Amino acid sequence: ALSLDQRIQTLAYEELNKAVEYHQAKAGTVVVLDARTGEILALVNTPGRNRAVTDMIEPGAVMKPFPIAKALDSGKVDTTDTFNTLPYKIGPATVQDTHVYPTLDVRGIMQKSSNVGTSKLSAMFTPKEMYDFYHDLGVGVRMHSGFPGESAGVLRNWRKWRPIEQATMSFGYGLQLSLLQLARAYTVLTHDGELLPVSFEKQAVAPKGKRVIKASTAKKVRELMVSVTEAGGSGIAGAVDGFDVGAKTGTARKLVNGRYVDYKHVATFIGFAPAKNPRVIVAVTIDEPTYSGVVTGPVFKQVMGGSLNILGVSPTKPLT
């Protein structure tokens, strides 16, 4: 009475193992969720504990869709609004992007993964507003999936935030989530603005979402996220032939490993497809490979591609 699909589980397992071996990494995880139910279709880790659920990371750039969605959902910004995306200071700290652009619109902020752009969208909101939003996505909240050792992640009390911390949180540092929590947060994008419960049991009743953003906002964000896997986007390595894919990639950071402190870079890729009418969310992490997109994108691409095949979803465009 598990919701896991053996064919997808097997696919995930082989793709993860190939990537971990190839990049000589320390560990890895793949999660596949049903994008409209929250059921787990696959969950695999390298050998040891269930890191997908037990281990939390500072997610980095894969968090950026969320402050973007919040800004659009508020009515305060439009996708065509343009921002100064030059590096800037918060007291003595600098917020800066990997690749510097003088200005980007909201689409460009998504496409190029701008930390400056995201932090400026977040800065339109009070600490309490952003905290309440992250809390409502499930950050720092127990999913009660029925897995033991389930991490709640970390979301610090907004009464303690400095401006720099609000800023870094918008681009995924200074708060912490497990990969399963991250996949679950993505249901806000796939399930028309409502956060779904996560479950490994075959569902008998339709799950009830908790509305976080408008359906129209969720639809717009999934459209923006397509640019990420197209030419000019930071996630081109996880494009899937035949489909439009909304995705993010980034370098997450792991600061806790089981019961111990740690400090490791974690390549991450998460996304959903088909982008207009998503069926599944695939999330991948690979711990300490020895360029996030190039490491995890191929895993994401084969797991997502194979998952859509296995579920019988027709390509929305001719294969190249």
Residue 10 φ/ψ region, left for φ over 0, alpha for ψ in the -120 to 50 degree band, beta for the rest: alpha
Q: Write the class of the CATH domain 6-203+215-310.
A: alpha beta
Tokens of 71: 């800004």
CA distance 56 to 171: 16
Alpha carbon separation from 46 to 21, 30, 81, 110, 142 (Å, rounded) = 11, 9, 43, 31, 23
Asked whether 171 and 61 are in contact (CB, 8 A), the reply is yes
Cβ contacts of 92-96, under 8 Å, gap ≥ 24: 93/164, 95/119, 95/164, 95/167, 95/168
Experimental technique used? X-ray
Query: Quick one: which of 10, 39, 28 has its CA closest to 196?
Result: 39
Encoded amino acid at 79, one letter: T
Map the chain to HEC letters.
Answer: CECCCHHHHHHHHHHHHHHHHHCCCCEEEEEEEECCCCEEEEEEECCCCCHHHHCEEECHHHHCHHHHHHHHHHCCCCCCCEEECCCEEECCEEECCCCCCCEEEHHHHHHCCCHHHHHHHHCCCCHHHHHHHHHHCCCCCCCCCCCCCCCCCECCCHHHCCHHHHHHHHCCCCCEEEHHHHHHHCHHHHCCCEECCCECECCCCCCCCEECCCHHHHHHHHHHHHHHHCCCCCCHHHCCCCCCCEEEEEEEEEEEECCEEEEEEEEEEEEEECCCCCCEEEEEEEECCCCHHHHHHHHHHHHHHHHHHHCCCCCCCCCC
Residue type, 280: V
Structure tokens at 151: 């991490």
Backbone angles phi, psi at 72, to 5 degrees: -65, -40
For this entry, resolution in Å reads: 1.9
The pair of three-digit structure tokens given for residue 167, joined into one six-digit string: 């800023």
Contact 130, 158 (CB under 8 A): yes
Sign of CA dihedral 46, 52, 58, 63: positive
Q: What is the distance between the alpha carbons of residues 45 and 190, in angstroms, rounded to a whole number? A: 24
Q: In 10 A of CB 29, how many CB atoms?
A: 26
